[PDB]
């Protein structure tokens, strides 16, 4: 058992990411016969340093999973990654927390494994390039770096929404991320404070590795508004250390182990 290479050879670089072809889940389990029950895989011919969780927030979207499977279990394992897929889905119809359901993702998934590296993913964003490595760096990484939805061009330097990746311990060091943003806006730019104050920085890949779609129904040329940083800098200074991991609460309603991954239906509150 030797330790995996540097850069899997396994790669293939561009890839044809595209949503004309439906699909069905039955056909991507046989396509993906390693894949064992829950959503979990670790490579064979060698030891994968990374093991990481993937977490996806999510609720009634499960047209877009689908398609967040077909493409990416082929590609974690071309990158020679020891992972597990988590479907963090929200029971109940109050507004959204992405940040929240997140926190709850890192939580459970410890139960199963003793992953060190998290990557946090929108269901609806697919990387382009197999070389954007869904893995942990020595600071915090944004994944989803050039999204076709944006021009292919990152909306603003200290944007870290989409996809990212941090290690246990960088997870840690923040105190998580906020429970309180509900679906206000802004839970990505205050994760980037935390970031600022805890002095680490933003990792990325170049801007064509870092290429990615964005699950967008039939076809959609028309690139989304603009976002812009909502500034809560001050506002993070006072609350990163009361609002994050300390204070989650929530309650696991069901759990059930899908072959390609694991569903957490959880009941995490209202706003108030």
């Known amino acids: 058992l030797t330790a995996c290479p540097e850069e899997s050879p396994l790669l293939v670089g561009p890839m044809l990411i595209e949503f004309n072809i439906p699909v069905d889940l039955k056909l991507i389990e046989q396509q993906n016969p390693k894949v064992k029950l829950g959503g979990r895989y670790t490579p064979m011919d060698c030891i994968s340093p990374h093991k990481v969780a993937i977490i996806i ?28 897929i988590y479907v963090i889905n929200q ?18 998934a410890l139960k199963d494994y003793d992953y060190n590296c998290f990557v946090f ?26 999204m076709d939805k944006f021009g292919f061009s990152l909306p603003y330097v200290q944007y870290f929404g989409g996809v990212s990746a941090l290690s246990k311990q ?15 806006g802004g839970e990505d730019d205050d994760i980037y404070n935390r970031l600022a104050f805890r002095g680490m920085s933003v990792s990325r890949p170049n801007a064509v590795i870092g290429k990615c779609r964005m699950i967008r129904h039939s076809r959609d040329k028309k690139n989304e508004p603009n976002p812009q940083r909502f500034d809560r800098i001050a506002h993070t200074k006072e609350t990163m250390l009361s609002d994050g991991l300390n204070s989650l609460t929530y309650m696991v309603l069901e759990v059930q182990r899908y072959p390609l991954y694991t569903k957490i239906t959880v009941d995490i509150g209202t706003p108030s």
Not at 122 to 143: A, E, G, K, W
């Open 57 to 84: 927030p999510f609720r009634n979207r499960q047209e877009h999973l689908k398609y967040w499977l077909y493409y990416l279990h082929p590609i974690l394992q071309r990158q020679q990654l020891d992972y597990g």
């Open 91 to 108: 029971a109940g119809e109050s507004m959204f927390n992405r940040a929240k359901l997140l926190n709850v993702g890192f939580k459970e």
């Open 170 to 184: 960088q997870f840690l060091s923040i105190n998580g991320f906020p429970n309180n943003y509900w679906g206000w």
């Open 121 to 146: 993913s929108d269901v609806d964003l697919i990387p382009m390039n197999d070389h954007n490595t869904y893995r942990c760096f020595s600071q915090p990484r944004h994944i989803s770096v050039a």
